[PDB]
Amino acid sequence: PQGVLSVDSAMPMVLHLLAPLAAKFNERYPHIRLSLVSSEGYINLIERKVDIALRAGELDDSGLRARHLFDSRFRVIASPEYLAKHGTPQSTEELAGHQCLGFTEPGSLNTWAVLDAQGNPYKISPHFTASSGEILRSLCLSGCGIVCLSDFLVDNDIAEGKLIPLLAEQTSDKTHPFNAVYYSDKAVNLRLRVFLDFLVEELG
Amino acid sequence: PQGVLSVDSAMPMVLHLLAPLAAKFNERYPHIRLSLVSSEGYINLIERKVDIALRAGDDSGLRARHLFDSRFRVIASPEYLAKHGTPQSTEELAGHQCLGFTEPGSLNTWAVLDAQGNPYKISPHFTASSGEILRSLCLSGCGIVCLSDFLVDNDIAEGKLIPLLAEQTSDKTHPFNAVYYSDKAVNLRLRVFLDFLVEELG
Ligand SMILES: [Cl-]
Ligand SMILES: [Cl-]
C-alpha cells in the first residue's frame, strides 16, 4: 500500500481520534501519505475532493458505503471553575439559570441529550455559539459555561479533572454511531481498505 | 454593550487565544453574546457573514488593527526524537518526517534557515488543512512541524513538544490583526471587543 489518502472529518474527530492513531498507522504503512483535512458536512466527500469521510450522520439512499467505527454518548460538562463561581445544576430545569453554550449551526444540536422533568430533551438558549464542537470544548475548559458534547471529545478532560460531568442521571444513555463514508468505486484502492481496516480495529 | 458579535478565525487562533480570553470578556461584558466561528480565509468576512476576522494575512473598506507579533518554531515530540534522533542542522530535516499543509503551499517553506541562509522547503510526509491538526500529529509523534509560537509555546513549556534547530530558526515575526469593515466599527460591542483584544494580546 502506497500513495496519498485524503481523510475528511470534523475537527474533534481529527484531533482526538485520528491524530493520536496516525503515528501507529505510519509505522505499519510508512508508504501511505495521509492527508487529514477538516471541513463541514459531506460536500468534499460527495464532490469527490476527499477519498473518505469519518462522520456521525446517517446517509442512507445516497449510494455511499458506510462502515461503522464506534458509538458515542453525549455528556453535559462544565469546568470546576465555572461550577465554583456559578453553582452546580441539580436538575435540568436549572440550566435556564446557567450559561449554556451551543452551535451556530446545526441548531438541532442545541437540543441537548439531557432530559427534563417530563422526559423530553432540553432545548437551550445559547449564550455563546461556535461553529465547532472543538471550540465549545475550549470555551468550556476556560469556564464560559455548560456544554453538551460527544464523549470522545471530553472524556480525557473528565479523567484529568479539567471538566466535571453534570446531571448524569438526567443525561440520555442513547448512543450515536460514527461511520467511515466513501464511494464504492474508491474501495478498489488498497490504501483506503487498509486504513479502513485499521480504523475499525483501533476505534471499535 | 449588548447583542451578538461574530468572530471568525483559523482554528488555532480560536482555541489557543480567543477561547481562553472569552471568560474574562464575559465577566466584563456579560450582555455580549460571542459567536466564534472557524473557516478558511476571508470569505465569511468579505461576504459579511461575520463582524470581525482575526487573521495574519484587502477588498477595500477593510480596517486592520494589530493584535500581536509571532515567531515560528520547529518542534517534535520527545517520543519522536527518541526514536529518530534530533536534527543538528537544517539539512538533516531531509532524513526526518516533516508534516505540512495541504494548502497554502507557501506555508511549507519553513522559517528554518539552511547553511546558505535560505528558508527550508519541505516535502511533507503527511499533510493537513489546519495548523491545529499539525499540532496534534506532532504531539502524537508523527514528525516535525513548523508552527506559530502561540500554538505550541505552552506545550514547549509543559515539555510535551521540543524546540528544534533553535539557532537556525528565523527570529523574524509576522503580525496578526483584527480585520473588519469600516462601517462595522460604529458598533459598540465590536469596539469594546477590539479594545479588549489589543489590551490582552500584547
Ligand atoms: Cl463539530
Ligand atoms: Cl491554520
In three-state secondary structure terms, A54 is strand
Cα separations in angstroms, A35 against B63, B98, B149: 35, 13, 24
CB A169 within 8 A of CB A4: no
The residue with cell 460514527 is: A178
| Separation CA A14–CA A184 (nearest Å) | 23
In three-state secondary structure terms, A166 is strand
Read off the C-alpha cell for A144.
464560559
What are residue A32's phi and psi, to 5 degrees?
Answer: -95, 120
| Separation CA B90–CA B166 (nearest Å) | 10
Q: Angle B7-A129-B184 (CA atoms, 0-180°, nearest 5)? A: 30
Structural biology method used: X-ray
Searching chain B, which residue's CA lies closest to the CA of residue A144? B23
Q: In chain B, after which residues is the C-to-N distance over 2.5 Å, breaking the chain?
A: 57
Cα separations in angstroms, B78 against A25, A39, B75: 19, 30, 10
User: Which ligand has its closest atom nearest to the C-alpha of B128?
Assistant: 2
| Separation CA A171–CA A121 (nearest Å) | 9
In three-state secondary structure terms, B73 is strand
Which residues, including other chains, have CB under 8 Å from residue B55's CB and lie 6 or more apart? B9, B10, B13, B41, B42, B176, B177, B179
| Separation CA A121–CA A123 (nearest Å) | 7
By the 10 Å C-beta count (0-12 exposed, 13-18 middle, 19+ buried), B158 is classed as exposed
Please measure the distance between the N-terminal and C-terminal CA atoms of chain A and give it in whole angstroms: 23
**Total beta-carbon pairs less than 8 A apart between chain A and chain B:** 110
Nearest to A26 by CA among A55, A9, A2: A2
| Separation CA A191–CA B21 (nearest Å) | 42
- Using the mean position of ligand 2's atoms as its centre, give its distance from the Cα of residue A96 in Å: 36
Which residues, including other chains, have CB under 8 Å from residue B186's CB and lie 6 or more apart? none
Read off the C-alpha cell for A46.
460527495
What is the DSSP-derived secondary structure letter of residue A93? G
Hey, are the CB atoms on A35 and B128 less than 8 Å from each other? yes
What is the DSSP-derived secondary structure letter of residue A124? P
Strands A52-55 and B32-37: unpaired
Nearest to A83 by CA among A164, A7, A16, A12: A164
Read off the C-alpha cell for A117.
422533568
The amino acid sitting at B182 is S
By the 10 Å C-beta count (0-12 exposed, 13-18 middle, 19+ buried), A73 is classed as middle
Strands B127-128 and B100-101: parallel
* Structural element, H or E, at residue A150: strand A147-150
In three-state secondary structure terms, B1 is coil
Q: Please, what is the angle between helix B188-200 and helix B19-28, to 10°?
A: 120
Across the interface, of B14, B38, B133, the residue whose CB is closest to A15 is B133
Read off the C-alpha cell for B95.
532524513
| Separation CA B122–CA B100 (nearest Å) | 8
Across chain B, the runs of DSSP E, i.e. the strands, are 3-9, 32-37, 52-55, 62-70, 72-76, 100-101, 109-113, 119-121, 127-128, 145-148, 162-164, 174-181
| Separation CA B74–CA B175 (nearest Å) | 19
| Separation CA A196–CA A193 (nearest Å) | 5
Nearest to B184 by CA among B21, B57, B44, B14: B44
Nearest to A93 by CA among A123, A63, A66: A123
Helices (H), A37-142: 43-46, 80-86, 133-141
CB B12 within 8 A of CB B154: no
**HSE of A203, CA atoms in CB hemisphere, 13 A:** 28
| Distance between B86 CA and the closest CA of chain A, angstroms | 17
* Structural element, H or E, at residue B185: none
All domains of chain A in start order, with CATH: 1-69+173-204 (3.40.190.10), 70-172 (3.40.190.10)
| Separation CA A14–CA A24 (nearest Å) | 15
The amino acid sitting at A191 is R
What is the DSSP-derived secondary structure letter of residue B104? -
| Distance between B25 CA and the closest CA of chain A, angstroms | 10
In three-state secondary structure terms, B141 is coil
| Separation CA B135–CA A142 (nearest Å) | 20
